[PDB]
């Protein structure tokens, strides 16, 4: 039996919907909240880790924020393990486009590429899709800052503010009432943190369980400078918003 043990998970269900794609969205609700908010002067990505312990080293932990290129970083909500493979495929693809055109990859193309890989797993091979959801902070000069979510089916939706992972619905109602189209990065930093404080996964929100990163156009000459804050710089902003 080389078909007696195959179950067929690259098939549609009577609904027109893939079993494994539906299940993946569940397993991503396990991972903690991850937020993207698009101000106009940048993009704020803020994620709360899905594990914490006190003997865990969280000062060097990378488990949510990863740089694909110098203007495009992602937040991860799902398995770290599943996301890693896509993260390194992303690095290759972004740099490939820079290598051949001598121009940094727009945000659109990269997002579309990773989505194709996810669809490719359900299209053929009998492979399961990597259950990842990314929130992409990206800059290009053609649309300015672009914000995107991709889901494990391989589809991308533009956003102004969006959340995945734990307490996705709660987070979203907070963004809708508080958002201005004229928000600064400062306003968006405070909004991101206050939203994570109501969708917190312990009972207290702590700097050492937060990864926080921005991409700012404040950096001179028109450059975009990604800064991934240290937990001790996240602490500073945690006192700004007065959680602490």
């Amino acid at each position: 039996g080389s078909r007696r043990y195959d179950s067929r998970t690259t098939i549609f269900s009577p609904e027109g919907r893939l079993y494994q794609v539906e299940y993946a969205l569940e397993s991503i609700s396990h991972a903690g909240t991850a937020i993207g908010i698009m101000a106009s002067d940048g993009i704020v990505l803020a994620a709360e880790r899905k594990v914490t312990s006190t003997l865990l080293e969280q000062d060097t932990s990378t488990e949510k924020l990863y740089k694909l290129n110098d203007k495009i970083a992602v937040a991860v909500a799902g398995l770290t393990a599943d996301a890693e493979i896509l993260i390194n495929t992303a690095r290759i693809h972004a740099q490939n486009y820079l290598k051949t055109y001598n121009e940094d990859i727009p945000v659109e193309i990269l997002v579309r590429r990773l989505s194709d890989i996810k669809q490719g797993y359900t299209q053929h091979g009998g492979l399961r899709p990597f259950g990842v959801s990314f929130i992409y902070a990206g800059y290009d000069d053609r649309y300015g800052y672009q914000l995107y979510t991709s889901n494990p089916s391989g589809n991308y939706t533009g956003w102004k503010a969006i959340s995945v992972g734990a307490n996705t619905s709660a987070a979203q109602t907070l963004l809708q009432m508080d958002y201005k189209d004229d928000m600064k990065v400062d306003d968006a930093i405070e909004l991101a943190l206050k939203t994570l404080s109501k969708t917190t996964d312990s009972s207290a929100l702590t700097y050492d369980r937060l990864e926080f990163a921005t991409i700012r156009k404040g950096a001179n000459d028109g450059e975009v400078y990604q800064k991934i804050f240290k937990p001790q710089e996240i602490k500073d902003i945690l006192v700004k918003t007065g959680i602490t």
Partner: protein
């Protein structure tokens, strides 16, 4: 690997085609109406949720050629795969045959991706249906084709696919005629706007319109334009 993900049925069917059409059903709604001097594909847009930046959000109508357009219904993941593949086909007709693609060629090509996954194993057909329309070069004849996830295609004068396609189909029985399609760009556009305002409703925010005019003219009608047709038709 070639372990059937498409396999024959006791009714003389294929399982994945029956499931595919229902996957096309639950997806978005496309209406295609062709005049004597235009084609119009207007489609349903999911932008119900707020804080969505509708501008950078993917379109329901993608141009494949400078006068051949394609719109879609079904899985939104699968459609984008086809749209990359079609773009290769478009450059290949130019490569070996010169001239930009004919509508009829491109219709057989999309269907030929579907066909492949229909007979072989290790693959399953995409749950995607398309309305392909446009001009052939040096023709001012509108072409309106439909592809379905079986790998079958049909020519139409009007067609609608998606959700509550029957409501829209019946509305066009009483408006549109094979005999004498609308003789104007705007009349065609307004008939497609009128049909969409039944089911999709919800302004120019969910309703889109793309117009192709004969011999290499693709124009897109912005939200504001769409809104003005909406109010006039509402009043009338």
């Amino acid at each position: 690997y070639d372990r059937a993900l498409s396999i024959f049925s006791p009714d003389g069917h294929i399982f994945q085609v029956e499931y595919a059409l229902e996957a096309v059903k639950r997806g978005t709604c496309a209406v295609g109406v062709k005049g004597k001097n235009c084609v119009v594909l207007g489609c349903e847009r999911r932008s119900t949720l707020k804080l969505q930046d509708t501008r950078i959000t993917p379109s329901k109508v993608s141009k494949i050629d400078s006068h051949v357009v394609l719109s879609f219904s079904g899985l939104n993941a699968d459609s984008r795969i086809l749209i990359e593949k079609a773009r290769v086909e478009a450059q290949s007709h130019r490569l070996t045959l010169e001239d930009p693609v004919t509508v009829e060629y491109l219709t057989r090509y999309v269907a030929g991706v579907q066909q492949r996954y229909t007979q072989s194993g290790g693959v399953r057909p995409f749950g995607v249906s398309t309305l392909i329309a446009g001009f052939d070069p040096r023709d001012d004849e509108p072409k309106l084709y439909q592809t379905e996830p079986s790998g079958i295609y049909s020519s139409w004068s009007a067609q609608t696919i998606g959700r509550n396609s029957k409501t829209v189909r019946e509305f066009l029985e009483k408006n549109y005629d094979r005999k004498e399609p609308p003789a104007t760009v705007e009349e065609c556009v307004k008939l497609t706007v009128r049909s969409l305002l039944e089911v999709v409703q919800t302004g120019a925010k969910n309703i889109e319109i793309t117009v192709v005019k004969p011999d290499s003219d693709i124009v897109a009608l912005s939200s504001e334009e769409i809104n003005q047709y909406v109010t006039q038709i509402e009043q009338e």
